[PDB]
């Protein structure tokens, strides 16, 4: 722990938890949001026999544990799970006590207000944090980009959000949430791999196939033409070496997986591709600034490490929108940490401690005070 | 040794990205200036033609 009473910066992103100290450039403890529970009961002795397993421990013990998600698309299952994982993060991973450091947290866009009130109340009772602040990840990604104008595409693991912000002003009237995310990607890839001869249901193979998505997946420039040329495609077809050692070969599926977000009719969504959701979002607001939105679009999330989103994005928007002004996307490398960086940015300046949510305000007005203290 | 080398390479990324972004800022400045100059020139030419017509009449 630093000698100074600097604040805690924790991004509880929908899919990854990244925690650390204020003034740091990158979060120190970063782990996926999976939680493992003993698949069977206790009869043995001498070691183990522990209920909750979180972090890399559960990653190593994936096979023996039922792998469960305490949060999915924002919905909260069991607050005890968050209690334990935050205990682990603060003491076993961050080696910090929350008594002496206020916490800045980031929440998924348009999270329930009742969810905020319950989570804040359990937090304040269970923990002894001196002060509090929670913010939407959209403005955090904006801060990471450091440009007040643009539309943020937050692609988490449970929801994809499109949020327009002009000159550092939120536009909730033109903000939308789409239920397509990593979960859907894994599902669709699971069914295609089932049609390829490999049919698995458990979560270990879920992580294997999301790793495959991280490594080999394409974003098709032209879809049906690329499957037409991918009929044989000995060179274009790509293989992976699974940890057991078998060589699993995939061809068109590499670019037929992320395409589903762009083409939701593959597995039955009324909503069109996410580019249509950015398009409608843009026109909902006044006409004039729309060009700037076209030229200032930002994309954020862990998924963004994949190739192909930028070219597809620009080409389709230019197809939909007039091609007079030039559209260009901006995306700094390793932007999944960017939100946490913005949290540090919030703690940089000396005005941030004017609106810390202190203990006594919550003791006076209950959780309801946040309704007036954040917004 | 390898990881240290990778870190200095990462610093290379950072500073070269800074060079690219300052260049891009100057690109926007000078391209906007070019639009303004061409628009003013066209307007002045149209005004010159109109005043020549007025002079003839």
């Amino acid at each position: 722990d630093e000698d100074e009473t600097t604040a805690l910066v924790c991004d509880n992103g929908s899919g990854l938890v990244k925690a650390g100290f204020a003034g740091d450039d990158a979060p120190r403890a970063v782990f996926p949001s999976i939680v493992g529970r003993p698949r069977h009961q206790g009869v043995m002795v001498g070691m183990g026999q522990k209920d909750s397993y979180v972090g890399d421990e559960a990653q190593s013990k994936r096979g023996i544990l039922t792998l469960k998600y305490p949060i999915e698309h924002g919905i909260i299952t069991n607050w005890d799970d968050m209690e334990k994982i935050w205990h682990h993060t603060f003491y076993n991973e961050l080696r910090v006590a929350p008594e002496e450091h206020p916490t800045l947290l980031t929440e998924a866009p348009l999270n329930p207000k009742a969810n905020r009130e319950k989570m804040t109340q359990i937090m304040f009772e269970t923990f002894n944090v001196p002060a509090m602040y929670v913010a939407i990840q959209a403005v955090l990604s904006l801060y990471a980009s450091g440009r007040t104008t643009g539309i943020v595409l937050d692609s988490g693991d449970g929801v994809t959000h499109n949020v327009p912000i002009y000159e550092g002003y939120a536009l909730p009237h033109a903000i939308m949430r789409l239920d397509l995310a990593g979960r859907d990607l894994t599902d669709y890839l699971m069914k295609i791999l089932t049609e390829r001869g490999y049919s698995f249901v458990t979560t270990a193979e879920r992580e294997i196939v999301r790793d495959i998505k991280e490594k080999l997946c394409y974003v098709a420039l032209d879809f049906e033409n690329e499957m037409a040329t991918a009929a044989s495609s000995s060179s274009l077809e790509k293989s992976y070496e699974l940890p057991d050692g078998q060589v699993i070969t995939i061809g068109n599926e590499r670019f037929r997986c992320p395409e589903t977000l762009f083409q939701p009719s593959f597995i039955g969504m009324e909503s069109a591709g996410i580019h249509e959701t950015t398009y409608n979002s843009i026109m909902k607001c006044d006409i004039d600034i729309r060009k700037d939105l076209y030229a200032n679009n930002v994309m954020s999330g862990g998924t963004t490490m994949y190739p192909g989103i930028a070219d597809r994005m620009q080409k389709e928007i230019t197809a939909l929108a007039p091609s007079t002004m030039k559209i260009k996307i901006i995306a700094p490398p390793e932007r999944k940490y960017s939100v946490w960086i913005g949290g540090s940015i919030l703690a940089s300046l000396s005005t941030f401690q004017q609106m810390w949510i202190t203990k006594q305000e919550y003791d006076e007005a209950g959780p309801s005070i946040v309704h007036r203290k954040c917004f | 040794e390898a990881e240290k080398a990778a870190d200095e390479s990462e610093r290379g990324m950072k500073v070269i990205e800074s060079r690219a972004q300052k260049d891009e800022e100057k690109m926007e400045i000078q391209e906007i200036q070019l639009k303004e100059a061409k628009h003013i020139a066209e307007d002045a030419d149209r005004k010159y033609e109109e005043v020549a017509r007025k002079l003839v009449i």
Binding site: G20, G23, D25, A26, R147, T148 | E25
Partner: protein, 52 residues
């Protein structure tokens, strides 16, 4: 025109500099430290415990 350009680029550079400040504060103390496995050759063969 120069004033418009200066104002825009100055706002951009102000946000850029505030972003640099966080990196200026710390740059290495965020990574974890080294604990690789090596040596241990001198340890004995008959462990004081029976997991030998």
């Amino acid at each position: 025109l120069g004033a418009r350009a200066k104002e825009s680029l100055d706002l951009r550079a102000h946000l850029k500099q505030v972003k640099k400040e966080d990196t200026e504060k710390e740059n290495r103390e965020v990574g974890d430290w080294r604990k690789n496995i090596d040596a241990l050759s001198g340890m004995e063969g008959r462990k004081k415990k029976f997991e030998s």
